[PDB]
Amino acid sequence: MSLQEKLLTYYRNRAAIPAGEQARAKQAAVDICAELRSFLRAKLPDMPLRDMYLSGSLYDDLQVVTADHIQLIVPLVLEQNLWSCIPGEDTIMNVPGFFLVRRENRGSSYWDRCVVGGYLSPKTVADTFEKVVAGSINWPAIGSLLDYVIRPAPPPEALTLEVQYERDKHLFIDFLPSVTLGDTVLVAKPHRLAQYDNLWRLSLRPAETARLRALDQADSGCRSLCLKILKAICKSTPALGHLTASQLTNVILHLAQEEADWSPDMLADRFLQALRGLISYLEAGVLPSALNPKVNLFAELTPEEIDELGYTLYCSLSEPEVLLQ
Ligand SMILES: Nc1nc2c(ncn2[C@@H]2O[C@H](COP(=O)(O)OP(=O)(O)O)[C@@H](O)[C@H]2O)c(=O)[nH]1
């Protein structure tokens, strides 16, 4: 077979999620989200929140192999005049793509409770909801009308709920606290390196995936399909598991800036170009975000982890078919 054929076979048999499993898992999330809105509205009346909503690859049809996880965004309500956010490149940590949230002026905020040293801690905010998750063993049988049973995920996933549905199906929904100041959207998703775990993370995923969708919609291209193959490959081994969806998505987006033709028959050529690009970014130890160039997406990896990834992908341009096995 030509590489083209092996790629389509790989996507079909490995990357692609069965349309049945996919939609059913999706509905489970929708069902639980709707329930969690109502119940938590009553269980946490003091907490300034917006409506919770779903987010992630499962919601965008970019999830691969199996459908088992999705994010539940928890938007905190902040008084814009009592808080300011500071871009990481302007702090002592010097981490682009990550933010401090500083308490301002006077007034009272419910969220004053999560402030330490005059800053809103993403970890302290997380601990508030780890309590809420752990406290779910006190809840009534929510969603029991549609035969769902909500249980705290097994440790250490202190922010995850586990939804079991028909039959021996499990959907893992993790709570993700989010903060909007001005037009800056931040999520409490810790920096990989622990010395940065108290910085808020700038939300880049909605813009990345929207760009991906718009580009493929315009010409029925195979950018998304190619991405899904990569995500599936990177889920195959521990080594390649240190690569993220965001990283691979931005590899694709960068290549899309150089290549306009993403016809289905160009898939194999793009897949090779994608690997070449990935190798070059690893070589340089820098993968700039396509939508926010100031942010290096490889800055959560140690230089050794980067070198080891490069070593893992060294012969991929000459033996690409090996990745699919
Ligand atoms: N839903 C969501 N996830 C984010 C965001 N920022 C970072 N992430 C993280 O990125 C991951 C989800 O991205 P996703 O596209 O689903 O990757 P996938 O799990 O490989 O399919 C999770 O680990 C999230 O914690 C964000 O703004 N929204």
From Swiss-Prot:
It is linked to Optic atrophy 14: A disease characterized by visual impairment in association with optic atrophy. Atrophy of the optic disk indicates a deficiency in the number of nerve fibers which arise in the retina and converge to form the optic disk, optic nerve, optic chiasm and optic tracts. OPA14 is an autosomal dominant form characterized by adult-onset progressive reduction in visual acuity, and pale and excavated optic disk. Optical coherence tomography discloses a severe loss of the retinal nerve fiber layer. It is found in: Mitochondrion outer membrane. One of its GO terms (biological process) is mitochondrial fission. Its main location: mitochondrion. Homodimer. Interacts with DNM1L. It is a single-pass membrane protein. Expression is relatively high in heart, skeletal muscle, pancreas and kidney. Residues 28-37 are annotated as: Important for interaction with DNM1L. Residues 1-325 are cytoplasmic. This is Mitochondrial dynamics protein MIEF1. GO terms for cellular component: mitochondrial outer membrane; mitochondrion. The lineage of its organism: Eukaryota, Metazoa, Chordata, Craniata, Vertebrata. Mitochondrial outer membrane protein which regulates mitochondrial fission/fusion dynamics. Promotes the recruitment and association of the fission mediator dynamin-related protein 1 (DNM1L) to the mitochondrial surface independently of the mitochondrial fission FIS1 and MFF proteins. Regulates DNM1L GTPase activity and DNM1L oligomerization. Binds ADP and can also bind GDP, although with lower affinity. Does not bind CDP, UDP, ATP, AMP or GTP. Inhibits DNM1L GTPase activity in the absence of bound ADP. ADP binds at S55, S57, H69, S203, R205, K231. GO terms for molecular function: ADP binding; GDP binding; identical protein binding. It comes from Homo sapiens. Changing K235E: Abolishes nucleotide-binding, but not DNM1L recruitment. Belongs to the SMCR7 family. Keywords: Membrane, Mitochondrion, Mitochondrion outer membrane, Nucleotide-binding, Phosphoprotein, Transmembrane, Transmembrane helix.
